[model samples]
Target chain A: IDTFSRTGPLMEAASYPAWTQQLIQDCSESKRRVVEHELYQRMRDNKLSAKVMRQYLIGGWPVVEQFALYMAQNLTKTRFARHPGEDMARRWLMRNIRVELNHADYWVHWSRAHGVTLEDLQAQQVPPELHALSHWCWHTSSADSLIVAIAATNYAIEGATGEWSALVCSNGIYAAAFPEEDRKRAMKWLKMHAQYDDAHPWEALEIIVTLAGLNPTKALQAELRQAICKSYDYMYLFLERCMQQEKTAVTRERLA
Target chain B: IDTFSRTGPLMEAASYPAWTQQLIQDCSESKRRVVEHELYQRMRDNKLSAKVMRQYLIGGWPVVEQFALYMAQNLTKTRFARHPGEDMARRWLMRNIRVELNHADYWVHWSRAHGVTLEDLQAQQVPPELHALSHWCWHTSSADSLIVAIAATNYAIEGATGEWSALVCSNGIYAAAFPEEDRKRAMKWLKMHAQYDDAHPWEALEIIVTLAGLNPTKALQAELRQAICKSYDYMYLFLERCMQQEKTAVTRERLA
Candidate 1:
């Protein structure tokens, strides 16, 4: 119920300011439902098979690869900002990207656990629906302003990923989904993200709040909302595609 | 001897204008020697094993992946320029990047031909010496001026690549280097680059000249020369490392 309990300020702020409250509220509310999405539910119920899981991994590889680039683009844009905390934000974003630099390897490990060959993984032709989020992320992160990029990428997409990671890692659902032998290897990515990125949204919120404070205009407010909401929409679409994939597999299994 | 025979202006052009001719001269002259570099020479000479070739591919994968990103960074930067021909350059660069976007797949094909898996390719930990150029390319392209980026990337690295491709593709050496069955698949990347990018250097030179013309100054000349030369140096280092890799393998085999 209280996911922000680990962070003191996030939990014990003496009467959260309107914008800060809105930030936390928006993230937590969306995160709550995303955990309830069919994808996670099936995962928890142990109804999703290894084959489908492998397919999801391949289908979602484009997003995994592009995520670091999106963050890199954001880091470059933010580095040019002359405002206070811009340097800090840029540094954090850079570190985040550096940390995620080798994440594709982790996914490779997960794919290998499912008996997927490197050749097959490389040859994967990601369908358009699965790759749409990647294109949108690149377009938004590159073409948009620094705040918009941070709002959309760091606060929105990353925040949601953190939530999903925490949910699956904490519940027995994720462990039961994979075979016991493969579970440890497969959970490396999810475990690392759940642990390291637990505070990612808060850190992003701190930067976003600082930038928003610098320019507390109505227009800035609208832009921030739009960026965060747009990113959330894409994040939902990403998960929705996974659910659709699971549904297709179930239909095919029933027919067989 | 005449590399620019396919294109009319590149061939005739009234004794070759100073910058354009300089561009062609530099790229063609350096490329003629680069193909003679120990790495490709050994491949042509059939001295390298598939294992060593696979190692080279894996080691150099970072540069292959980042080349497109470096161009993407340049495209983002160029899109903001208000100069004449900037739009054209931006459009061309975008197309250039898009064309090269799935180039990693071609490399994947080559890797497969060598019995290297996509998992291994994705898991490649690019050695520091080999990865230096990739980092430098990103830094220069992202941080430097548009002209400098073009001089380093399109004019220097890409131009050199075109030369290397042509040399390997034309000589029977490359075909002889691989087994008959794998040769065709392995040569896809080399052939495509050799055939399609024959004019890439000229196009880059045209853009560079236009940009250089817009800001004709001693300072600009120094910057362009430095960028181009630095890129060439890095390109040479990349090849030298491949040679070094082969040498190590040869030494190990001899000792064994």
Candidate 2:
């Protein structure tokens, strides 16, 4: 509670701070990968259906949701885990992370509107980049100090995800590709991300700035930059992998 | 915007403003009705197993979920439809509402842990309150003036929900009822509301206060009290439904 109170005043900036320019640029580049990526393309091209989205969304979560539960239990272990500010950082990070908690539902809803099934997501070992991004977060979440974990999440992932969310919403791809009901349904998510998360990163950055300022000895600024870069790279790589998969699928379809 | 802005200071008082005291009392009673309603009782204790909790919590939106959603949406509609404020209010409200987009997934995860099915939730068609709430919101959003809609949603519905949420979380009901695992899962929602000062009814009050101060002719205090009571009545009724459902099921199980 004290932590939240301390951090709230700093997040009211109406514009991007001048100091975060590079990280912002990198983040924007990374977000472009979503449209360019294979899986999202196949998804966009009507290759994926609602059933697949549904099962993938709900079915895939237990494993991860359990992990979230585990994180919740281990929240008290912050001090022993060597996290510098474990108490506030652990819960705060987890809450933000869980923002994606039901994202699978949206995807599942997206899939159900099409004709996909849960079995598909089950069989779909996350494309390498997806695995990479998720594993990156997991490894850091489990192993890093609270400061570093917060930095990585705030600087890297949220920034990229926010930008990509806007792109997916405005591209008209979702509305054009799916049937009317599916289009309406899928766009609901797209429109939401486009609207809300666009402002989230700026707010998150404010928190980072405040925390880093408190512990200037930690060189938290550098860490923030690195996390942003890491997120961008992982997202780009995943998009590329998804694109490759989409291309292969197209090739196979033509050959058939 | 002025209409919405003027209500806040009046609402934040430790004591209800004299002009609206009766309405506040009336609304509080209504709030009691919504939460202690009979329908929610049936849904919570169907005795099918923890599986029933899962179905209601997750899967498709059960009638209970729909009811909540309907009420929430309707409340929002009644207030903001005639908003005369800056663009900021519009952005803020829409963004916050959109966060609710993927909530169904979290419920789904909770459900499967107990072995409920999508079919069970989708097939559900319970009491009239479910659809009534949704229709109310749609009407408010499209037909009502912005101040009325915002007052209904922000000051009325949101405030009552926040209060109940804090009570439920503080009460440790889920912690007592379920094992550690389930307790943590249930905390996902409770924990969020337990600490919701920034996002709750404050904004609504702020708007109403500003508007009333700007122009005394609008009866801001009276209007706000009415909205608050109406919203409270709606939720109080729902909760009564839940409690009734729970008690009846427990009895039937004992006899069986």
Candidate 3:
């Protein structure tokens, strides 16, 4: 059998190429901006007032509801496709997609702990501001190459998401928010993303580097860098809006 | 959590709806025609001459190289998709796609055992006659809804492929062709497909019916039946070309 016979998924991250190191450096800075965002900082320190927690859960709903779709859109591009990285990229995407599919439930339970009832969640409406991140995700996955899509959505977005979720999970608020026994159910979403032995974003970087080859064209390199940064930018746009909305509410209450 | 919570994959086939029964009946007939085609029957009975086997392997190449893509294309439509089956369908598709990805190698090994050299396989050009089925698969997946795509590609095509593969797997020609120990390696492809505890095609029909609902509109019913039948039609066209090529070879040999 030819070497094309298997995907060879065991190539550890420590052995990835030079091109990946540069891209990782870039996304790391992008993630720092997101992880340091005031909103996420608040989430990490467990200082989100009860009102902000409610706003945050509702704000996060659109993306939570549709992330599997974004990932699956990338999954489609892997079909019959050939790349040095094809097997790993395809296998990695397929294996995690279903895990993502049902995670909307974890969001549901987590949101419930924050006082967003099933009825409230069902009745919620998101403004255009809060919906931009997911919209960006939808557009990227639908239109970009698999390389660009995986970089933007998985490496950039999920990387930042994992770090912040890890921070929040370590805080006491999540544990205190639910009755002790119920914390397990409510914390499922946060704990899962908190890197409890999962590093999908890091693995995504491996797939991207392997797929892009030992070196890619400068333009391709720039495109991947920009796509990852762009994902982070959208997160900023949405978080900025959340902070603004919270501010406006405070102003209204002061006038009363 | 509402029952939209999980995909519940264990709902066995013994208790499906009336609507599923009818659609399955329609697809079963479509499968029968393909399974009973003379080319396939020859394969099952191990009556194929060496030259015929060569033609069959090369004739089958286009689909073999591309089937994973067809299945992945269907996998894309399941992302965050809301159906009675969203979880099960997404999970099932994701779970098996990697299995399909490596399958091209099995075809490679199987073809090698049949006397089609690896170089010969690579250097091959598919005539339009042989390319039609894969082209149809490409078109069906790209243009159809997930339901129609899955019905045509998985429910119809794979059902036929699996049944015939099972038939050929049970025969001795395969075992006889390879050195005794090598047979295990070569026969992996066929034995794996020969209903060796797999029922992907059967499971696909369950997904199709669940996605389509307990009682779909009559027009939807007609569309699904036609899509299933159309897949079978393409299979016939490809097989007919293989037979004609075999006949032409015989005619040339006779004149000599």
Candidate 4:
């Protein structure tokens, strides 16, 4: 069994440096082409139709809400984190969860601006694949080590988001795509994420590094890597499903 | 082995209906969250910084170039696609690839408007992770079944892209983000995509269904699913790396 499964006592603080570097390197090495996908390329180029866009915006609400809820579960996971680093990780996750909660209204405004009512967003049916992705976050955050939970949600998901938001804001892609009025109304969430939220993934990494330092075992390190890759796999499946919805809309348009 | 590895002579056209439905259903079922990720979410919300945007825009040049090259590979694979469907798939992929090549200058125009030199974009180094993602496209489009190639590249990636672009456009997030003058310059790529590429993934799926009908075995159906999921896994890794770069920049700025 992996070292993380046995749950041994935490190691000395001095044992962390080498392990931390390895963990960071592993995470970096595992990084793949999330943002650079053709999907985003099409987005930058402004290739999708209005109907398709509406479907996507409306379709996305459930998972968006799920992200905050899953984050809360991660906060609880911190309670089970090993001492010393546990206190720090708990504090950071608590702050992060609150920050995530505050973003909910921004999403609601974004939905409203796009013609999707808050009622529509709140009442939308979850697609099967997305349900699995959301539940995976809940499962990992609730069941894994505090470090692994942060690695999946904070380091992987949040870090990618910061970059994605930065890309959108910096490029003025969104500004060029929408009318000034809709742009103004919808700008809240992206702006806050772009301007703020930048520190999340990095801080999450710091937390992971600190935990690694505290525990300093090869098995724990391996488990950390597994958790991260597993989280991304869920995301990958999620994108494919979203694309399927797009395909369905496009097919309907073609037939129409 | 999961049904994709075995090679059997193409089945009769009469055996296709159930297989066609199965393929479409399988592809549809495999779909997950692409446009809803934090990366696109930020774009929709208008949250990315200019520097990060430039970096992404600049860094993206090679992959843009890669898409045409890989599509060419899929075109060659069509030579082996089962009869009747082979001719159709080849014609469609050819037209699609040509359309993709025609967009190169659009991206060039995009980068220029954003202040990234074509020279710098051409010379930029491919990150190790991105290099793998690019090559995976090359490998899958070349090595897999014509249906699988289309499923991976055209269906999974391009389909998701349509939704992403549609979201950016309908929301007017780009319009809000860019100044009027710059917005005009940046609008070319996105406008073309939002308007034109809507049919790609659907057409690709239609082609897959046709091929499945031509060769109706449970094996080919299973293979088609595997190919689609594999393509998404590559995309997942790609996003993770991009997110890492985003995290790195944010951390660097904070430390600065």
| DockQ, all candidates in order | 0.03, 0.02, 0.36, 0.01
**Candidate 3 residue spans exceeding 4 A from truth:** A1-19, A79-81, A117-124, A196-198, A248-256, B1-19, B26-29, B79-81, B115-124, B196-198, B250-256
The whole-model C-alpha lDDT of candidate 4 against the native structure comes to 0.61
Query: Could you give candidate 1's per-residue lDDT for residues B133-168 as a string of tens digits?
Result: 777787898799877887788767776777666666
Weakest lDDT window of 10 consecutive positions for candidate 2 chain B: B73-82
Task: Give the interface RMSD values of the models in order.
Answer: 11.3, 15.0, 3.4, 23.0
Judged by TM-score relative to the true structure, which candidate is superior, 1 or 2? 1
The list of candidate 4 runs beyond 4 A from truth reads A1-256, B1-31, B79-82, B195-197, B251-256
Q: What is the lDDT of residue A92 in candidate 2?
A: 48
| Winning model by TM-score | 3
> Candidate 3's error at B12, in angstroms?
9.6
Q: Write the per-residue lDDT of candidate 3 for residues B178-208, one digit (tens) a residue.
A: 6897787678777777763457776887777
- TM-scores for every predicted model: 0.50, 0.40, 0.86, 0.43
Which residue runs of candidate 1 sit more than 4 Å off their true CA positions?
A1-16, A26-29, A79-81, A123-126, A176-181, A195-197, B1-256
What residue runs in model 2 are displaced by over 4 Å at the alpha carbon? A1-256, B1-11, B14-26, B33-88, B98-102, B176-183, B196-199, B211-227
Candidate 4's displacement at residue A22, Å, is: 64
Query: Model 1 RMSD to the real structure?
Result: 19.6
Task: Give lDDT: candidate 4, residue B179.
Answer: 83
lDDT by candidate, in order shown: 0.66, 0.48, 0.73, 0.61
Task: Look at candidate 4 and tell me the lDDT of residue A90.
Answer: 54
